[PDB]
Amino acid sequence: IVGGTASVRGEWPWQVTLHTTSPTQRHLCGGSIIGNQWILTAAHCFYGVESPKILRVYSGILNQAEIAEDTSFFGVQEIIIHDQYKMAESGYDIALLKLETTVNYADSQRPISLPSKGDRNVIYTDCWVTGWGYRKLRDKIQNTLQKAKIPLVTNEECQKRYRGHKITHKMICAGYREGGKDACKGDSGGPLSCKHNEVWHLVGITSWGEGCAQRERPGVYTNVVEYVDWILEKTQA
Numbered sequence: 001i002v003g004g005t006a007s008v009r010g011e012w013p014w015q016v017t018l019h020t021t022s023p024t025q026r027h028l029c030g031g032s033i034i035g036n037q038w039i040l041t042a043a044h045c046f047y048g049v050e051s052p053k054i055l056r057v058y059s060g061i062l063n064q065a066e067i068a069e070d071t072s073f074f075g076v077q078e079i080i081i082h083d084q085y086k087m088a089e090s091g092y093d094i095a096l097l098k099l100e101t102t103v104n105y106a107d108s109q110r111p112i113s114l115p116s117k118g119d120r121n122v123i124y125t126d127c128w129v130t131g132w133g134y135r136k137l138r139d140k141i142q143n144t145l146q147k148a149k150i151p152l153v154t155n156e157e158c159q160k161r162y163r164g165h166k167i168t169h170k171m172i173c174a175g176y177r178e179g180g181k182d183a184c185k186g187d188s189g190g191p192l193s194c195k196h197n198e199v200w201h202l203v204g205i206t207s208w209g210e211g212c213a214q215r216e217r218p219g220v221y222t223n224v225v226e227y228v229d230w231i232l233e234k235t236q237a
């Protein structure tokens with residue numbers, strides 16, 4: 001996260017840090033708890049990932065330092081990638097992780113509500129992006145979870161900032177016309193939480209952008225509401 005600040009412990013209880021144990025354990029991507037056994041994240045996050053066995057999901061984490069060899073985690077039973085996904089920039093950058101065990105909800109770890117179709121006309125004026133990603137373009141995974149408030153921008157405006165790209169309605173952008181605040185490497189799969197009527201909603205999934213926090217280059221996120229049907233179908237037994 002560029003231009004953000006340290007999060008308060010338990011401030012984003014749905015945020016998880018997805019680690020890979022290969023070659024050595026390290027933060028790979030962000031993710032959001034949306035169900036007792038389900039993490040919603042970005043598809044492109046599993047590039048070069050041949051098996052879910054090397055994945056470890058940690059919930060209730062503020063600082064990466066909290067994660068040690070003796071720290072409990074959730075194993076991943078299955079990685080579900082949208083069959084239409086090819087690459088982040090083309091869209092469909094969404095994936096579900098079915099955990100091997102169920103998450104016991106608490107103030108430190110609970111699910112975030114998915115947006116409803118009857119909310120696409122809703123004007124989110126309080127949206128935040130979070131994660132342990134880079135603070136700049138050339139940096140490293142941050143220890144403390146960072147947060148940054150960022151305004152959503154119309155798709156028409158976003159398309160203007162991304163000539164050469166096709167910003168579809170299945171994407172949603174957010175950022176400052178002057179930049180300064182935005183997601184970066186490591187924040188992928190992270191949630192773009194928005195607050196309406198004081199009820200947190202998972203509006204987007206951190207996906208891509210040109211550089212990080214550059215002026216006139218809004219972050220591009222997966223427009224979650226466009227995938228509620230997909231999510232329901234993939235989560236049902």
Ligand SMILES: *[B@@]1(C2=[C][C]=C([N]C([N])=[N])[C]=[C]2)O[C][C]([C][O])O1
Nearest residue numbers: 184185186187188207209211212
């Ligand atoms: B992601 C990721 C997601 C979004 C952005 N945003 C910008 N401004 N470039 C950068 C990086 O984080 C992990 C990586 C793939 O493993 O992509």
